[PDB]
Design a protein around this ligand. Structure first.
Ligand code: SF4
Length: 208
């Protein structure tokens, strides 16, 4: 078998899937991470949101989007009039890939290789088959490329509703900036970028 496929059980039950992901060895990232971080939410969710990976806070909370980027995402969701409890939120890879620097105040995320993304993608497929979302919001380059192709450029398709043929259930896809990118930079640029994230979330939420 390839990647995580043999570790994925034949079930759409999210609790069963999350327990199975705790035992995944589909790539190397399970070794140094604290635990797998599966998606959070229920199968009635109409909107699925996919980030890159659990970060330092998520790796220990056991839940996605709990750190500063998650708090910015909550502020954007509220501004977009979307209830976070109604979404299903997850990440392209389920184990935190990291390093430390001497004197650092946190573990530093490292970018998943395309190999790791493809290895973990069976979990993402299981999640999408389980949830059957009407729309998938892809937060950042890694997540967007996971579904849209390794050459895809988030920066070139902002605001656009995409549909690709190899995605199960043919949901609408909206690729946007990852909330972590909005945490730093000059104020005017951060404020414009925040408005653009709210716009993209509203596009996704307006999908019938
Ligand atoms: S990152 Fe994904 S494929 Fe790799 S070990 Fe973790 S759950 Fe399995």
């Amino acid at each position: 078998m390839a990647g995580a496929q043999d570790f994925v059980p034949h079930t759409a039950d999210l609790a069963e899937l999350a327990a199975a992901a705790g035992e995944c060895r589909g790539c190397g990232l399970y070794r140094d991470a604290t635990q797998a971080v599966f998606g959070a939410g229920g199968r009635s969710a109409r909107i699925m949101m996919i980030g890159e990976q659990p970060g330092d806070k998520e790796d220990l909370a056991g839940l996605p989007f709990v750190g500063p980027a998650g708090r910015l995402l909550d502020r954007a969701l509220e501004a977009a009039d979307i209830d976070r409890d109604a979404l299903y939120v997850t990440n392209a890879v389920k184990h935190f890939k990291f390093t430390r620097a001497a004197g650092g105040k946190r573990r530093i995320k490292k970018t998943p290789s395309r190999t790791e993304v493809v290895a973990c993608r069976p979990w993402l497929i299981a999640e999408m088959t389980s949830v059957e979302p009407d729309v998938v919001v892809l937060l950042g380059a890694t997540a967007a490329k996971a579904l849209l192709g390794n050459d895809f450029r988030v920066t070139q398709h902002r605001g656009e509703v995409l549909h690709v043929d190899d995605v199960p259930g043919d949901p609408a896809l909206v690729a946007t900036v990852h909330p972590s990118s909005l945490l730093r930079g000059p104020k005017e640029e951060r404020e414009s970028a925040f408005a653009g994230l709210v716009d993209d979330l509203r596009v996704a939420a307006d999908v019938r």
